[PDB]
Amino acid sequence: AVPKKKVSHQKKRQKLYGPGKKQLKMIHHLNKCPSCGHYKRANTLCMYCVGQISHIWKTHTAKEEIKPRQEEELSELDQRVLYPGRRDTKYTKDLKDKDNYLERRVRTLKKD
Amino acid sequence: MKVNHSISRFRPASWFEKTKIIPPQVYIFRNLEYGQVLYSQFPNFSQTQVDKLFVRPNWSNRKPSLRRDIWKCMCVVNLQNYKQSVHLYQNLCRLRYLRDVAQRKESDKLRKKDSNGHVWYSGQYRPTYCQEAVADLRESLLKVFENATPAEKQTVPAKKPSIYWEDPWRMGDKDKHWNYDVFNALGLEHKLIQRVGNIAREESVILKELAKLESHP
Amino acid sequence: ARTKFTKPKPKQPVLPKDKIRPPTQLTHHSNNLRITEPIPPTTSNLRCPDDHPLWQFFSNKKFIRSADDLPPSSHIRPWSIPELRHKSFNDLHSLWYNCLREQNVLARENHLLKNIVGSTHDEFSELSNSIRTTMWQIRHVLNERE
Amino acid sequence: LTRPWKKYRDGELFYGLSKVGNKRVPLTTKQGNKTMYKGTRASGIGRHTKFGGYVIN
Amino acid sequence: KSRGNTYQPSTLKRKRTFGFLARAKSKQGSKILKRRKLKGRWFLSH
Amino acid sequence: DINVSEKIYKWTKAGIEQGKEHFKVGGNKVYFPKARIILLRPNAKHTPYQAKFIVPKSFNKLDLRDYLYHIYGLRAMNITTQLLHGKFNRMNLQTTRFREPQIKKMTIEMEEPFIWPEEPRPDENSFWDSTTPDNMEKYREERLNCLGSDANKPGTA
Amino acid sequence: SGSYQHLSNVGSRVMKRLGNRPKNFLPHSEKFIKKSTPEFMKSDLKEVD
RNA sequence: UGCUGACAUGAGUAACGAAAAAAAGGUAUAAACCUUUUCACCUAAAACAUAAGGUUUAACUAUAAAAGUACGGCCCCUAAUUAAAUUGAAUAUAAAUAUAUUUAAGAUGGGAUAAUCUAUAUUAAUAUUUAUCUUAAAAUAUAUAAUUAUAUUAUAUAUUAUAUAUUUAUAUAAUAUAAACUAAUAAAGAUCAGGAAAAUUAAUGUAUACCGUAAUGUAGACCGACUCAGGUAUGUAAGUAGAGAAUAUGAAGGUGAAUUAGAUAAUUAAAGGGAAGGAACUCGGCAAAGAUAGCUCAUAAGUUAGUCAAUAAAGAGUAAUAAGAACAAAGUUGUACAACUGUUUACU
RNA sequence: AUAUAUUUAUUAAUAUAUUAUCUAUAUUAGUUUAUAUUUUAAUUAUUAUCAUAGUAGAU
Ligand SMILES: [Mg+2]
Ligand SMILES: [Mg+2]
Ligand SMILES: [Mg+2]
Ligand SMILES: [Mg+2]
Ligand SMILES: [Mg+2]
Ligand SMILES: [Mg+2]
Ligand SMILES: [Mg+2]
Ligand SMILES: [Mg+2]
Ligand SMILES: [Mg+2]
Ligand SMILES: [Mg+2]
Ligand SMILES: [Mg+2]
Ligand SMILES: [Mg+2]
Ligand SMILES: [Mg+2]
Ligand SMILES: [Mg+2]
Ligand SMILES: [Mg+2]
Ligand SMILES: [Mg+2]
Ligand SMILES: [Mg+2]
Ligand SMILES: [Mg+2]
Ligand SMILES: [Mg+2]
Ligand SMILES: [Mg+2]
Ligand SMILES: [Mg+2]
Ligand SMILES: [Mg+2]
Ligand SMILES: [Mg+2]
Ligand SMILES: [Mg+2]
Ligand SMILES: [Mg+2]
Ligand SMILES: [Mg+2]
Ligand SMILES: [Mg+2]
Ligand SMILES: [Mg+2]
Ligand SMILES: [Mg+2]
Ligand SMILES: [Mg+2]
Ligand SMILES: [Mg+2]
Ligand SMILES: [Mg+2]
Ligand SMILES: [Mg+2]
Ligand SMILES: [Mg+2]
C-alpha cells in the first residue's frame, strides 16, 4: 500500500497529461448575444445583459431608506457631542476593504 | 421578621397617603454602561423593579445589573396628587412593555441605525434608550394630565407640577418639545437639580432635600 | 409518566365571589398611549462659559496647534542655571507651575497626534523636553541654594 | 468563515499572531486570582479597620 | 482515559512554587537563581 | 442630630459658599509636582458636564481633585477611576513578548459644561493630516510583503 | 497608530537591544530601511550614530 | 537506517473534523461578511448570570465608572501547612542541617450597622448529617353537647374600625387561592458523637483610599501539537404533562459551522421493513429481536426470618378489545469460584 | 385603533386596507397556576412543524 520505487518523470507525465480525459477541452459552444452583441455560451444567457436588466429592476423597485425624523434635525455640533467618532479594529478595517477579496465579473469579448 | 419592605410591592395611592414617605413624585434613573433607563416610585430601586421592566432582553437591550456604581438619577418628576404619580408610573411602564414586546417593530424603525443595520452603539452604550425615556415621559405626562384637569379651584390651588433634570442638555429643545399648551396650562416648570456636592456619591441626601422642598406645606 | 391510564388532575380551588378581597388598585394605565419618536438632547440648552477652566488645556481655544502657531525653535531657549539663581522662591514656584501647565497642553497634543494621526513630527515632544530641562534646572538651583 | 478574505486554511490563528511565548513576565493588576492585590502605589493614606474598611489619615 | 492535559493552570500555585520569592527565600532556590543569572538568562524565575 | 452623609454634603456646600476647598486639604505638601494629565475627548456615554483625563498611575482620586483646584481652579465633585489593561505586543515574532503599558484614566463631574473645539479641516493643520502616515504604512507593508513577481505589480500607496 | 507607548517605558531591555544593534550588522538593517521607503525622502549617504 | 539545507515520488490522491437551509438587498463585486423574511437545531441548553485560565480575543484607543447597605478583594481572625526568623550554653548533628517552644505568614472558612437607610476610628473607666410523625383542639361534609371522615398545624402584609406619646409607631379585632420553594427559633432519632481564633459604656470624630468590573467562560477566546466529537467549578434554567431536574413540544434567547454544487454505481458505516422457517448461525444466542402498566392489589419453594428471595415468575382492577409519540421497564434453572457492598492492571 | 373614499354632522356611520386578541393590582416572603378587578383582548374552519419516516393500516 506504498510506492516501492520513486515514480520517474516519464511515468508521472504520461499518467497525468497522457489520457484525453484528464486534459481539458476546447470550448466550441460559444455564440453571439442577440442583445449584448458580445460573446456568450450556447444555450445560456448573457450575464451582462441579464445584469443590466437586474440593475433596472433594482433601481425601479427599491425600498426608500428609513431616515428617522429625529436625526436630520440635529446640527453638526449636536451630532459630534452625541455621536462621537470611534476607531475600528484590524478585522473591521480589513472587512471594509472589500476590493482586495471581492471582484466583479469581466465583460466578455465582442464577437464579429 | 419583616421580609417585605416599602419597595417590594407596587405601592398604590392609598398606601402613599397613609405612609406619606415622599411627596407625589416618580424618579427616573439611567445606567452609565448600557445607557438604559429605569423608572422607580421611590428614591431607591432593587432587583424586583429591574426584572419587571426588562422582560425581553436580547444582545442589544441586555438586562442590567443592580450595581449601584453605574446607576444615576436622571429626572425626578413631581405631580400634584398621588393618583397622578401612580398613573404616570403605570403609563411609563406600559410604554416600556409596548416598546420592548408588543410594538417592537414600529419602535425599531424610529431608532437610529448605523452601518451594518444595528442600533448605534459606542461600546455597549446606546443613547437611543435615554432619548426614548425622555420622549415616553413627555407622552405619559401628557396622557396623565388630559384625564383629570379641574380647570378651576376645587378646594385649594394645586401645587404646580415640576420636573428636575440633572442638566438642561438631557431634555430636548424647549420649543419643538415640552411646549404643548396642556403643560403650560398646569405651569410645568423645567428646573435643574441642586449641583454642589458629589451628585452620585450623595444622591440620597439630595433627593430627600429636594423631597422636603417639594412638600412645601 | 403520562400513561394512557392517567386521569386529569382536579381543578384548583376557586375563592367564592362573596369572600374575594377587592384589589387595592382599580384604575390602570391608559390604553390610548402611542409610541413617539425619540427626542435627542440638544446643546442649544447649554451655556458653556467662555472662561471655563478646562480652556487652559488648549492653546488659544484651538484643537491642535499647527506648525505656524507653535513657537519656533530658533526664537526660543530654555533657562540657564545662572539665570535661575537670580530668582526668588515664589518666582521659581510660579515658573514651575507655568512650565507644568504648558506641559499638560503639549502632552494632550502629542497624544492626539501619536494616537490618531500617527505622525512622528514630535515638535511638541521636543518643546516638552525643553521645558523638562528647565524644570530640573530649577530643582538643582533650589538644592544648591539650600 | 471567521475572516471572509481567507477562504482556505493558511495557518492564521483565531486571534493574535502566536499561541505561545514567554510566561515569566511580571504580574499586573488585571490578572490573577480574585484574592490577588497588586496595587499602584496610589494609596499610602489611612489604616484598614478591623471590620474591613478604611480611615483616611 | 485521555491524557496530555497534565498542566492545569493556576496563578497562585504557579507563583507560590515556581516564583521568585519561592526560590529567593531558600538556599536551594537561591542556588538555581544564581546559576541562571550566571548563564545570562533573561527570565530568572516566574 | 444628622447623618454622616448629610454632614459631608454640608461641608461641600460650605466650601463652595465661602470660596474655599470643597474637600479636606491633607498635610503632605508637594511644592514642586511633576505630574502631567492629558485631557481626553468625550465618549458617547459621557455628558457635556464631565471630563476624562489620563492621570499618572500612582495618582489617588483625592490627588486629582487637589491637582485641578489648586493649579487650574477647576472643582471636581465626583471623580471616578478607570484603570485599563495592557495587551501583549511584539514588533516581530522573534522578540520577547511584553505587555503594553497600563494607563490610568479618571472621569470628573464638573459644574460648568464644556464642549471641545472643532477639529481642523485637513487643509489648515499640517500635523492633523492622517493621509500621509497611513499612506506611508501602506507603502511600508506593501514593500515588506512583496516577495517575488509582485515587485512589478503597481502599488496603491 | 495608537499604542500608548509614548506615555510609558515598557520593555527597557528589548528596546535597548533593538536600538543598540551591533555595528558589524548595521548593513542588515540599512537594507531594510532603504527598501521600505519612498525615493523622495532617501539620501545615498550613510547615517551617523 | 550518517548531520544540516533545498527539492522531488506517493499526488493534485486522502482529507477539509458530529450539523438545514432558501430568496431579496447591501453589491449590474459574494454559497463563506451584514440586514429583512421563511425553515430548522439547541432549549434543567448550543440561553442568562458567574469562578479559574488565557497571545484583549470584547460592542476598542474618545475602551471595561463602587463609602457601604447581597460587592468582592483589601483589612481583623485563624485551619491544614510553611519559615537563612526568636530561644559561656534550648537539644542534636562531619558541613548541609534536623528537632521542640515562640513569633510571623497562610482561605478553600468566620467578621455588628443598615431604605423609616447605616457609620467601622481616638481617648477614659469598668452550629455533623437528618424528619416535621402520632394524639389533641379549632374549622369543614353526612348524620345526632356525643360520633365518622377531612385541608391546616409556627412566622413572612395589605385593608377596614378602635386605645395610647401625638397625620408618625405600637396594640387590639375582622377579611384575604392551591402546588412547589426560600432563612430563623422552635421541637427530636442514630452513632460514625460532629473546626480554630479576633467586651460594655461616656465623650470626641467621619470630606468616604487602592485593586477587580470588557467579551469567552459545557469553549472558534482555557488544558489537550489543531478555530481537536476529549477534560473544565456554581445558580436560574417559561409554559403544557408528569412522581420526577425522566421523557415529548418549545415561549424568549442563541444558533445553523474555512468547504461547496450534481447521481447517489460496486462497496463501507448508522438506521427502517421483510414472506415461509426460528439458532439450523456461531468456539459460544456475539449482534439483533423480545416489554399487555408506570398506579392499586396479589405474590411460592428455599431460607441465616431479612417482603432475603422480590421489582418473585404467572395473575387481577382502571377506558384497551385492529393499531397508531417519547422515556422507565427484558424470563426460569443447574453447576464451579467468592459470604455480601466495594478495590485493581490511566491506555489489551 | 389608524389611513383613504362615501353618507351624516372635526364627531358618528358604511366600504376598503393594515395592525392586535396584550397588559396592570390583589389573595402575608419568591415562582407557577387559578379567580376577581382594568382594557376590546373572539371563536370556528383548514393548514404546518417536532417527537425513529413519532406511531399503526394501506399503497
Ligand atoms: Mg452610593
Ligand atoms: Mg482572571
Ligand atoms: Mg505537553
Ligand atoms: Mg504543592
Ligand atoms: Mg474601581
Ligand atoms: Mg550518505
Ligand atoms: Mg491513489
Ligand atoms: Mg480516489
Ligand atoms: Mg474526497
Ligand atoms: Mg447577492
Ligand atoms: Mg432532559
Ligand atoms: Mg421545562
Ligand atoms: Mg454567558
Ligand atoms: Mg495573621
Ligand atoms: Mg475567602
Ligand atoms: Mg467578567
Ligand atoms: Mg458581564
Ligand atoms: Mg472543542
Ligand atoms: Mg491553549
Ligand atoms: Mg422559538
Ligand atoms: Mg454563545
Ligand atoms: Mg465542519
Ligand atoms: Mg423474516
Ligand atoms: Mg412472519
Ligand atoms: Mg449448531
Ligand atoms: Mg455448523
Ligand atoms: Mg447480547
Ligand atoms: Mg414461604
Ligand atoms: Mg431499558
Ligand atoms: Mg457438588
Ligand atoms: Mg466477590
Ligand atoms: Mg460489585
Ligand atoms: Mg485495563
Ligand atoms: Mg426540537
XYZ file of C-alpha atoms (C1' of nucleotides) in Angstrom, chain H residues 33-249:
217
model
C -19.482 39.125 5.688
C -24.104 42.478 7.160
C -29.617 43.281 7.152
C -35.099 41.519 6.357
C -38.428 37.225 5.818
C -39.221 31.771 5.598
C -37.376 26.811 7.552
C -34.707 24.203 11.143
C -31.336 22.795 15.977
C -30.345 23.624 20.956
C -33.992 24.763 24.963
C -32.737 21.519 33.826
C -29.128 24.162 26.799
C -25.837 25.352 21.957
C -29.901 30.585 26.781
C -28.928 34.156 31.114
C -25.517 35.381 35.210
C -20.638 33.724 37.282
C -15.470 31.264 39.158
C -10.269 29.678 37.120
C -7.496 30.340 32.666
C -5.765 32.929 28.697
C -1.295 35.979 22.751
C -7.703 41.941 24.883
C -9.522 37.796 21.700
C -14.923 42.429 23.507
C -19.977 46.310 21.120
C -11.909 49.037 21.060
C -7.586 53.617 21.627
C -12.899 59.103 22.641
C -12.200 51.493 25.754
C -14.368 47.873 30.838
C -17.238 54.100 36.457
C -18.024 51.473 43.698
C -18.275 54.592 51.467
C -21.456 50.720 52.437
C -26.388 48.991 52.919
C -26.287 40.640 48.842
C -19.836 43.640 46.203
C -15.977 41.022 46.023
C -10.856 41.657 47.014
C -8.092 44.874 50.522
C -8.253 44.713 56.426
C -9.202 41.599 61.702
C -9.033 36.218 62.909
C -7.354 31.689 62.349
C -7.342 25.544 59.858
C -4.068 22.027 57.003
C 0.753 23.855 56.496
C 5.311 26.914 55.806
C 9.612 29.955 57.742
C 18.648 31.629 56.119
C 13.011 34.373 61.753
C 13.378 34.174 68.082
C 15.323 30.704 72.490
C 29.673 30.618 78.231
C 25.490 27.418 76.603
C 17.124 25.152 74.018
C 18.501 19.866 72.088
C 21.209 17.039 68.193
C 24.296 16.527 64.263
C 31.162 15.659 59.688
C 29.191 20.636 56.827
C 24.468 20.946 54.611
C 21.064 20.812 58.545
C 17.126 18.371 61.973
C 14.152 18.590 66.316
C 10.978 21.320 70.468
C 8.912 26.421 72.092
C 7.700 31.207 70.468
C 6.712 34.741 66.676
C 5.085 35.700 61.538
C 2.720 34.140 57.158
C -1.095 31.211 55.183
C -8.594 30.655 52.577
C -10.730 26.587 50.128
C -13.649 29.383 56.247
C -15.697 33.244 60.400
C -16.311 39.125 60.673
C -22.113 44.330 64.162
C -24.971 48.803 61.294
C -28.320 49.310 57.529
C -34.330 52.159 52.678
C -38.052 54.581 58.375
C -31.232 53.721 55.004
C -26.073 52.881 58.244
C -21.081 54.865 60.280
C -16.110 50.635 61.065
C -11.978 55.460 64.133
C -9.301 58.149 69.003
C -9.372 58.759 74.223
C -11.020 57.341 79.677
C -13.322 53.947 83.109
C -15.344 49.108 84.222
C -23.859 25.384 64.624
C -22.254 16.773 61.528
C -25.982 14.563 58.963
C -31.355 14.030 59.325
C -37.729 14.357 59.821
C -41.622 17.736 60.854
C -44.507 11.710 62.591
C -48.807 10.376 66.223
C -52.717 12.394 69.868
C -55.220 16.984 70.871
C -58.060 21.246 69.509
C -60.242 24.642 66.499
C -62.840 24.747 61.224
C -65.467 21.808 57.384
C -69.237 17.468 54.937
C -73.112 13.274 56.167
C -75.625 12.098 60.375
C -77.429 13.436 66.395
C -73.382 18.674 73.725
C -71.898 12.772 71.857
C -69.926 10.106 66.751
C -67.485 9.021 61.233
C -64.369 11.391 57.747
C -61.392 15.830 56.103
C -57.047 20.938 54.401
C -54.255 23.173 58.314
C -50.593 22.835 62.417
C -45.273 28.110 63.910
C -43.523 33.305 61.346
C -43.181 36.145 56.494
C -48.501 42.179 54.899
C -52.158 44.762 52.945
C -57.277 46.724 54.014
C -61.094 48.276 57.467
C -62.535 50.193 62.828
C -60.981 51.299 67.776
C -56.999 52.727 72.504
C -52.164 55.013 73.649
C -46.877 59.795 73.268
C -49.159 62.767 69.422
C -51.116 62.859 60.164
C -45.717 59.488 62.775
C -45.124 53.917 65.706
C -47.378 50.079 68.824
C -51.568 47.125 70.375
C -56.331 45.137 69.585
C -60.450 42.881 66.495
C -62.323 41.074 61.336
C -61.110 39.803 55.787
C -57.962 37.555 52.284
C -56.448 30.647 46.236
C -53.796 25.990 45.548
C -48.717 23.486 44.332
C -43.585 23.972 44.820
C -39.571 26.824 47.285
C -36.631 30.159 50.480
C -33.983 31.892 56.302
C -34.768 31.568 61.686
C -36.269 29.758 66.790
C -38.943 26.247 67.982
C -39.395 20.531 68.748
C -36.096 15.153 68.411
C -33.705 9.785 66.190
C -28.903 7.353 65.400
C -23.813 6.647 66.342
C -19.911 7.491 62.658
C -20.503 11.602 68.920
C -19.901 16.459 64.887
C -13.468 23.164 63.252
C -9.687 27.208 65.225
C -9.103 32.333 66.535
C -10.105 38.043 66.988
C -16.278 43.081 75.803
C -19.631 47.319 77.551
C -20.206 52.128 78.430
C -19.132 58.087 78.309
C -17.018 61.842 75.285
C -14.913 63.315 70.582
C -14.576 62.143 65.170
C -16.123 60.822 59.800
C -14.718 65.493 53.383
C -15.522 58.282 52.439
C -8.015 55.068 49.885
C -6.138 51.052 46.305
C -7.443 46.734 43.116
C -11.292 43.744 40.478
C -15.646 45.202 36.767
C -14.993 44.352 28.731
C -16.050 39.772 25.970
C -15.238 33.982 26.016
C -16.246 31.053 30.075
C -20.119 22.710 28.588
C -15.398 26.675 24.619
C -13.550 29.311 17.483
C -11.465 33.449 23.148
C -8.896 27.891 28.804
C -5.800 22.281 29.356
C -5.392 18.729 25.223
C 0.510 19.521 18.707
C -5.105 21.849 15.609
C -10.610 27.501 15.329
C -9.214 18.891 18.115
C -16.796 14.982 18.642
C -11.666 14.606 24.638
C -11.092 17.409 30.168
C -13.241 22.005 32.919
C -16.360 24.509 39.245
C -21.739 27.367 40.650
C -27.117 29.436 40.437
C -31.769 30.247 37.427
C -32.711 27.112 33.834
C -41.230 29.927 30.535
C -45.190 27.181 29.964
C -48.179 22.091 28.862
C -47.540 16.891 31.176
C -45.816 14.205 34.701
C -43.697 11.108 40.974
C -39.749 13.324 38.844
C -34.003 18.009 37.051
C -37.079 11.267 33.349
C -39.431 11.719 28.580
C -42.358 14.953 24.312
C -43.055 20.219 22.391
